[PDB]
Design a protein around this ligand. Structure first.
Ligand SMILES: O=c1ccn([C@H]2C[C@H](O)[C@@H](COP(=O)(O)OP(=O)(O)O)O2)c(=O)[nH]1
Ligand SMILES: O=c1ccn([C@H]2C[C@H](O)[C@@H](COP(=O)(O)OP(=O)(O)O)O2)c(=O)[nH]1
Ligand SMILES: O=c1ccn([C@H]2C[C@H](O)[C@@H](COP(=O)(O)OP(=O)(O)O)O2)c(=O)[nH]1
Lengths: 136, 136, 136
C-alpha cells in the first residue's frame, strides 16, 4: 500500500554524500536510516549517543505512525540497538528524526558517517475512545 | 481512526490523584501510562520492577492489539525502559495493565507515584492461517 | 482478520517432536515460536545466541509484515529477550525464521529444546512514497 509522506532535508550532505532512504525491494517493509554525522562516533559497551539523520518527515495523517527498530545484524551480531528500544514517530511530529543508539554488547563499536544504523516502518494506528465500565 | 475501548478502573486513585490517559494532541499515536504506586520505587542499574497502572482494558475486537513501548526521553536520556522491551496486550486480555520497568542504564532512578513511564498504541493485527507447502 | 500465509517446514522434528505454532485463543494476536534445537543452550548473563525455529514463511503480500517480540514472563521475570529487541520479517523474506535470544539479566538460563521463547504478530505496513518539500 503506498501513501505519500512529505520530507524536508535538513542537512546538505543528505542526497549528496549519501542517499535518501529507499525500500531495497518491492516487498520491503522498512527503510534503512543512515547516521548523518560529521565524524565517526566510537561507542564503548554501555554508551548511548544521539545520531541525527538530517531528515524531518511529516506523516500528517492521524491513522498512521512510524516505528524505528534496530537492524538485525547489527543488533544481534554487534549489540548495536536503540537506547529507547523502539522509537515511535507521531503524525504531527515535524522535527528532525534522531536515533538513540545504545551499545548493549561487550565490544566498542564505531559508527561511520553515513552508516545504516536503524530502520523505519509505517504502521496504521487506531486512537482509542475509552468507554468506562465498572465491570466487563 | 477512533474505535471504542472499554476500560475499568481498579484503583480509587486513578482519575482522582492522577488522570486517566489521554492523547496529548489530535495527531498522537500513543497514550502515556502512569505508575499507580503507593510509594516511590528506587531502581539501581540492572533492576527491574513491576508497576501497576490501576487500569484494565478489554479491546475485545480480534483485529486489534495494543503495544506498550518505552518513552523516548526516559529510555534514551535515563535508561528507563521495559523489562520485556515491548509488551503486547491481546484483545481478550482483561486483567490489570502491568508495566515491566527495567533500569538499563548506569544511575539509580526513582519512579514517582503517578509519573508517566511508558506509552501504549493500538495497532491492527492479522491472524495467520498457515498454508503448508513443501516449497515456495 | 484472517489472511493465508504459506509455511514450509525445514526440520523433521517440527510438527512431530513439538507442534506447529497456533493461536492459543481466538482473541490472540501473537503466535509463540519454539526453539528448534538439538541440545539445550545455557546462556550466561550477557550472552546472545541464535536459535532456529525449523520454519520458513512467505508472507508474500507487500501490505503485511511480521514482528518478533519477547515473551513477557520470560522477558520480565527471567531477562530473556531478543538480541535485536524486535525482529521484522518482510513479505519477501523466505529463509529460516531465526531468533536472536539475549540474556539481559543476571542469572544463567538454559533454553530447552522446544521451549517457547518469542512470539510473532502480523501487522499491516504502509510503503511511503516521499514528497520532497523545502518546508512544511
Ligand atoms: O527514536 C525516536 C523517538 C521519537 N522521536 C521523535 C518523534 C516523537 O513524536 C517525539 C517524541 O517522542 P516520544 O516517544 O513521545 O517520547 P517523549 O514524550 O518522552 O519525548 O520525538 C525521534 O526523533 N526519535
Ligand atoms: O507489558 C505487558 C505485557 C503483557 N501484559 C498482559 C497482556 C497479555 O495478554 C498478557 C500475557 O502477555 P504475553 O506477552 O503473552 O506473555 P506471557 O505468555 O509470557 O505471559 O499479559 C501486560 O499487562 N503488560
Ligand atoms: O529476528 C529476526 C529478524 C529478521 N529475520 C529475517 C527476516 C528479514 O527479512 C531478514 C533481514 O532482517 P533485517 O531486520 O532487515 O536486518 P539486516 O538487513 O540487518 O539483516 O532476516 C529473522 O529471521 N529474524
Amino acid at each position: 500500500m503506498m501513501k505519500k509522506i512529505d520530507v524536508k532535508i535538513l542537512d546538505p550532505r543528505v542526497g549528496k554524500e549519501f542517499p535518501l532512504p529507499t525500500y531495497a525491494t518491492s516487498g520491503s517493509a522498512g527503510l534503512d536510516l543512515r547516521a548523518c554525522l560529521n565524524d565517526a562516533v566510537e561507542l564503548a559497551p554501555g554508551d548511548t549517543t544521539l545520531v541525527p539523520t538530517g531528515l524531518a518527515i511529516h506523516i500528517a495523517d492521524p491513522s498512521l505512525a512510524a516505528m524505528m527498530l534496530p537492524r538485525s545484524g547489527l543488533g544481534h551480531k554487534h549489540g548495536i540497538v536503540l537506547g529507547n528500544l523502539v522509537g515511535l514517530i507521531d503524525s504531527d511530529y515535524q522535527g528532525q528524526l534522531m536515533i538513540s543508539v545504545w551499545n548493549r554488547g561487550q565490544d566498542s563499536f564505531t559508527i561511520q558517517p553515513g552508516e545504516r544504523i536503524a530502520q523505519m516502518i509505517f504502521v496504521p494506528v487506531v486512537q482509542a475512545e475509552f468507554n468506562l465500565v465498572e465491570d466487563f
